[PDB]
DNA sequence: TTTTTTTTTTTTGAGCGACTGCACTACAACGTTGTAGTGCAGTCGCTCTTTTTTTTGCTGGTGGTTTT
């Protein structure tokens, strides 16, 4: 199902992504997680925020 | 295939046009001489702007910097 989350800032969207990750876990542990980004810098900032939120940011692809 | 020395600067404006001095003949005043007009040459001032006009792909799209 296609889901669009309207928000004013990206911190609430990162909290929603954290809630989706902690709610629904992947069946395969080595299955990659695709996070579509605008650029490499936004991918690095999202990896920084996911490392600060989860404690670990690994096996996450930013295509 | 190897390798040596070394510390002195220079030069540069020219054509256009006038000022002044000396020679040179034409002609009228008193055969000869003084004044006037022009030619030629040495010397010298002067003077040489202003300015601005543009398209280029931010990531146009299997793209993306950096660690063992």
Å between A30 CA and B57 C1'? Answer: 41
The distance (Å) linking the CA of A60 with the C1' of B51 is 61
Phi first, then psi: what are they for A51, rounded to 5°?
A: -70, -35
What token pair was written down for A16?
Answer: 């929603």
Question: What torsion, rounded to 10 degrees, do the Cα atoms A51, A54, A55, A59 define?
Answer: -60
Q: Which two tokens stand for residue A61?
A: 């692809």
Q: Name the token pair of A13.
A: 């969207």
Give the DSSP H or E segment for A10.
Answer: helix A10-23
Tell me the technique behind this structure. Answer: cryo-EM
Resolution for the entry shown, Å: 3.7
Give the N- to C-terminal CA distance of chain A in Å, as an integer. Answer: 21
């Amino acid at each position: 199902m296609l889901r669009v989350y309207h928000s004013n800032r990206l911190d609430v969207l990162e909290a929603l992504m954290e809630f989706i990750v902690e709610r629904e876990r992947l069946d395969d542990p080595f299955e990659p997680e695709m996070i579509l980004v605008q650029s490499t810098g936004m991918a690095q900032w999202l990896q920084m925020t996911l490392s600060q939120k989860f404690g670990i940011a690994a096996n996450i692809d930013f295509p």
